[PDB]
C-alpha cells in the first residue's frame, strides 16, 4: 500500500482580490490534513481524526513558524520579480514531501516553481539544485553555498518526513486504510446518429486505485477503449468511466474482479 506526504505553498504577488497572499496546505494522499492562510494567520486541522487527537502545541507553534515563513516566501517572490523586471501578479509555489512504498522504499522530493513552471528541483542523493534559467542559477549558487541547509533537507526528506507520514497514517487508520467497494453499472447511450456507445461506470470507492476494461465474449479486450478520470464523488469516495463504441465490463478493485454482462 503506497502512501505519500506532501506540503504545498502558494505566494501571490499583489492578489488584487481579497484572497490570501500566501496559502499553505498539507496533504496525506489527496486528503486535506492541514491549512494556513495569510488572512487567518492560524494553522487549522482539516481532517477530523487529527483535530483532537493531535496535541494543541503543534498548531500553537507551527502557526508562529508559518507566520515566519510567509514573509520569507514573499521576499523570494519579489526578488525574482525584480530579476525578470515584471509588474503585476505572479505566482510562487513550493512543494516538499516523502513517499512510502509497499516494500518500504523511501523517496523524497523538494521543488520550487515560478508562474506554474519548474524553477528549482532539489536532488538529495547528490545534494544539488537543478536550475532552469540564469536567474535560477543566480539563486542556485547562493543556496548551494550554505551546505548545512542542504544536509538538513536531505535528512529531513529521508527520515523526518517518513516519520511524520507514519504518525499521520496511524492517527487516521479507519479513514486512510479503509476499503469501500465500487458500485458498477452499465449504461447505453447514443451520441451520434446510428453510433451506439456503451459506458461502464463505478461510483463510491476507496482507495482510488482501480482497474477497468471492456471485454468481447469475455475472452478479448478491445483497443478502442476511451478512459475517463478518477473523479471525486463528494462523500469522500471516487468514481470512474470506461467507454466503447459498438459485451462485458471488467472492474478490478482491492483484489476483487467484478464482471458485468450486457
Amino acid at each position: 500500500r503506497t502512501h505519500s506526504l506532501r506540503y504545498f505553498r502558494l505566494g501571490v504577488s499583489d492578489p488584487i482580490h481579497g484572497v490570501p497572499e500566501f496559502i499553505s496546505v498539507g496533504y496525506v494522499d489527496s486528503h486535506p490534513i492541514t491549512t494556513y492562510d495569510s488572512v487567518t494567520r492560524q494553522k487549522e486541522p482539516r481532517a477530523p481524526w487529527m483535530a483532537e487527537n493531535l496535541a494543541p502545541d503543534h498548531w500553537e507553534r507551527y502557526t508562529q513558524l508559518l507566520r515566519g515563513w510567509q514573509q520569507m516566501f514573499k521576499v523570494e517572490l519579489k526578488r525574482l520579480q525584480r530579476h525578470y523586471n515584471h509588474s503585476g501578479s505572479h505566482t510562487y509555489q513550493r512543494m516538499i514531501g516523502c513517499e512510502l512504498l509497499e516494500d518500504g522504499s523511501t523517496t523524497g522530493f523538494l521543488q520550487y516553481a515560478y508562474d506554474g513552471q519548474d524553477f528549482l528541483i532539489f536532488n538529495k542523493d547528490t545534494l544539488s539544485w537543478l536550475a532552469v534559467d540564469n536567474v535560477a542559477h543566480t539563486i542556485k549558487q547562493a543556496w548551494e553555498a550554505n551546505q548545512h541547509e542542504l544536509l538538513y533537507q536531505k535528512n529531513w526528506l529521508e527520515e523526518e518526513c517518513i516519520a511524520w507520514l507514519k504518525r499521520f497514517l496511524e492517527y487516521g487508520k479507519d479513514t486512510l486504510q479503509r476499503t469501500e467497494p465500487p458500485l458498477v453499472r452499465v449504461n447505453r447511450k447514443e451520441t451520434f446518429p446510428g453510433v451506439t456507445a456503451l459506458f461502464c461506470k463505478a461510483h463510491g470507492f476507496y482507495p482510488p486505485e482501480i482497474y477497468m476494461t471492456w471485454m468481447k465474449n469475455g475472452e478479448e479486450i478491445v483497443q478502442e477503449i476511451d478512459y475517463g478520470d478518477i473523479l471525486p464523488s463528494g462523500d469522500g469516495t471516487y468514481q470512474a468511466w470506461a467507454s466503447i463504441e459498438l459485451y462485458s465490463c471488467h472492474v478490478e478493485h482491492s483484489g476483487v474482479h467484478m464482471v458485468l454482462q450486457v
Partner: protein, 98 residues
C-alpha cells in the same frame, strides 16, 4: 509567462435516477493561476446553495476545486456550470450529460 486552461467536468455522485436523493458535482481541475469564477446553474438561473471544497494543489503545479450541490433528478430540468478563468475570453459553460 505560463498559464493553463481549466478542465470542467460535470457529473452526479450517485447513479442517475429521477425523483431521488442525489448530488451534482462540478470538478474544475488543471488550471493556473488560482483566480477563478465558478457558478452552478439550473436551466439558466444560478444556484445560491452551493458548497465548494477549498483550493487544492497538484504535482504539476496546477490547482483543482470541487463545486457541489444537492439535487433531485428530473427529465424536464437541465443543469450546467459556468466557469470563467483569465485564460478564457468568454465564460465556458458545460452542461450535465445525464
Amino acid at each position: 509567462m505560463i498559464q493553463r486552461t481549466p478542465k470542467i467536468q460535470v457529473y452526479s455522485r450517485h447513479p442517475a435516477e429521477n425523483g431521488k436523493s442525489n448530488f451534482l458535482n462540478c470538478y474544475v481541475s488543471g488550471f493556473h493561476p488560482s483566480d477563478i469564477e465558478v457558478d452552478l446553474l439550473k436551466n439558466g438561473e444560478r444556484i445560491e446553495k452551493v458548497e465548494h471544497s477549498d483550493l487544492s494543489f497538484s504535482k504539476d503545479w496546477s490547482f483543482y476545486l470541487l463545486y457541489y450541490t444537492e439535487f433531485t433528478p428530473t427529465e424536464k430540468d437541465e443543469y450546467a456550470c459556468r466557469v470563467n478563468h483569465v485564460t478564457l475570453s468568454q465564460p465556458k459553460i458545460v452542461k450535465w450529460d445525464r
